[PDB]
């Protein structure tokens, strides 16, 4: 997959020429160490789409047309740049401001030409499903053989791209037969939530019923919005779940429920 490497080396260049983002990453790296010297900030760097067009249109059209192949190499590149920062004493997140849009759509107008493509929905958010942990990194301790043992759990919303599902439970006695106790509090949990979004009540065409679609909010984004708030979500538009085609059960046309991952959630008035 040398092309995924290409995406990383390409996104590298975008940063530090121009350097207008790098100062913000430095600011994030410094502020937390300042809290380390004291006596909270989410780690994500807002990327204005504004700037992306000046360098490459080829890579610009891609983030909109096929975000699954693009956002994650750009992301691995951002971590890679955050580690070359200063110094020692996490996946981060992209944001994507914009410079909308195409892809501008209210939730009423969407599906399927807009699927598997970046999207900025806007509408009312209800009913705001209750905040809950989600397991990601498995961490264990072997004794007396020692070392340090970890598994990595890949969920449905892991990264972006689809991957062979890891879940569930714990390995327990990975070879050889050594005992593995779960190490809690070293292991990583990203919070996770979903919130459905109804189209704006005032732009509703007729007595025809409202059509809402669900947005999963990863990491920091969680608990950022009470229900009934004007919201412009952004995110990649994802279709998850089999349509029933996987197994015999069940029998019916209905299928492929869709939702939006991430991403930003700019409130508005």
């Amino acid at each position: 997959d040398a092309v995924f490497g290409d995406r990383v080396r390409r996104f590298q260049e975008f940063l530090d020429t121009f350097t207008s983002y790098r100062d913000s990453v430095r600011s994030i790296q410094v502020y937390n160490s300042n809290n380390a010297a004291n006596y909270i900030l989410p780690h994500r760097i807002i990327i204005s789409l504004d700037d992306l067009r000046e360098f490459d249109r080829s890579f610009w059209s891609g983030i909109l047309v096929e975000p699954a192949y693009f956002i994650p190499p750009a992301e691995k590149a951002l971590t890679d740049l955050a580690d070359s920062m200063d110094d020692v004493p996490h996946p981060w997140k992209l944001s994507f401001k914009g410079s909308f849009g195409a892809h501008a759509l209210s939730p009423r107008t969407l599906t399927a030409q807009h699927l598997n493509k970046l999207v900025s929905v806007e509408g009312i958010v209800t009913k705001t499903s209750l905040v809950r942990p989600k397991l990601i990194r498995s961490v264990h301790y072997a004794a007396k053989t020692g070392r340090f043992h970890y598994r990595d759990y890949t969920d449905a919303t892991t990264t972006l791209t689809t991957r062979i599902p890891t879940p569930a439970i714990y390995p327990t006695e990975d070879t050889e037969g050594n005992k593995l106790t779960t190490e809690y509090g070293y292991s990583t949990f990203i919070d996770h939530q979903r919130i459905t979004v109804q189209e704006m009540p005032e732009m509703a065409p007729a007595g025809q019923l409202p059509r809402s679609i669900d947005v999963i909010l990863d990491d920091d984004l969680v608990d950022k919005t009470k229900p009934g708030d004007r919201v412009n979500v952004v995110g990649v538009f994802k279709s998850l779940g089999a349509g029933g085609m996987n197994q015999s059960n069940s029998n019916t046309l209905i299928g492929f429920k869709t939702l939006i991952l991430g991403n930003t959630v700019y409130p508005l008035h």
């Binding site: 599906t111 598997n116 019923l209 059509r211 029933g244 085609m245 197994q247 029998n251 492929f256």
Partner: protein, 254 residues
């Protein structure tokens, strides 16, 4: 499948050679449709049956095994019109609306199942859109076989062969092409024939470009195939629905 070649050759020869004196109605229907980015075609059956009786003889026989060979047949034509070489171009939906003989809702009982049925009723409510699939890639959980499955219409289980098993195939949603679907539900008109009983409502699935074509409460005349789905609720008792190709609202209605 030389027979499918034989059928599709007849459909191409029906689109390219059709003449209403003297413009080619279909062939231009096509161009004027790809330019606006409609990606659809509306066949007028009377012209069809005028052209060959034969292809309508088979199309009213086993519609759901044929109509998709007509779709691929027409999109293979838009390849030679809308573009030229020496992408991507979805396989167009065809909407066919024709007179025939109106078959009222009460009078649909078996016997015409999988035979095109024109009818008339007032739509109750329209169901919220949901996507089916058209072209989706699939990888194996183990041997990692990369399979591109072209799903057609008109449910379909995934293939189990490249332990391995029983069904080690994952849907890749990063490359999968999706369409839309509606589910109208229509109550037959109050004038006829309620008698003393509450009127029945057959469930209908619109799709692609007919979707959101009709505001609930407006009288319409649907065409479509008639067919049955399972939906556990025995024995066996499969329940009836009408696939729509294609819908035409009453005058005007805009």
């Amino acid at each position: 499948d030389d027979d499918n070649t034989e059928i599709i050759k007849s459909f191409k020869n029906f689109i390219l050679e059709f003449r209403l004196d003297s413009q080619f109605i279909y062939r231009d229907q096509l161009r004027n449709n790809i330019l606006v980015k409609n990606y659809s075609l509306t066949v007028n059956m009377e012209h069809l049956i005028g052209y060959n009786e034969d292809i309508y003889k088979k199309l009213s026989d086993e519609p759901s095994d044929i109509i998709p060979l007509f779709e691929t047949a027409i999109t293979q034509v838009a390849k030679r019109i809308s573009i030229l070489s020496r992408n991507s171009l979805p396989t167009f939906q065809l909407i066919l609306n024709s007179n025939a003989n109106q078959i009222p809702l009460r009078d649909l009982d078996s016997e015409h199942v999988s035979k095109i049925v024109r009818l008339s009723g007032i739509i109750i409510s329209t169901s919220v859109l949901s996507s089916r699939a058209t072209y989706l890639s699939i990888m194996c959980r183990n041997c990692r076989h990369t399979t591109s499955i072209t799903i057609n219409n008109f449910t379909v289980s995934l293939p189990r062969s490249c332990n391995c098993g029983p069904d080690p195939y994952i849907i890749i949603h990063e490359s999968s092409k999706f369409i839309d679907q509606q589910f109208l539900k229509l109550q037959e008109i109050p004038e006829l024939v309620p008698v003393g009983e509450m009127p029945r409502n057959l469930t209908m699935t619109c799709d692609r470009y007919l979707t959101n074509k009709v505001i609930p409460g407006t009288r319409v005349t649907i065409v479509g195939i008639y067919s049955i789905y399972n939906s556990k609720n025995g024995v066996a008792i499969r329940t009836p629905y009408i696939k729509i190709l294609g819908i035409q609202s009453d005058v005007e209605t805009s």
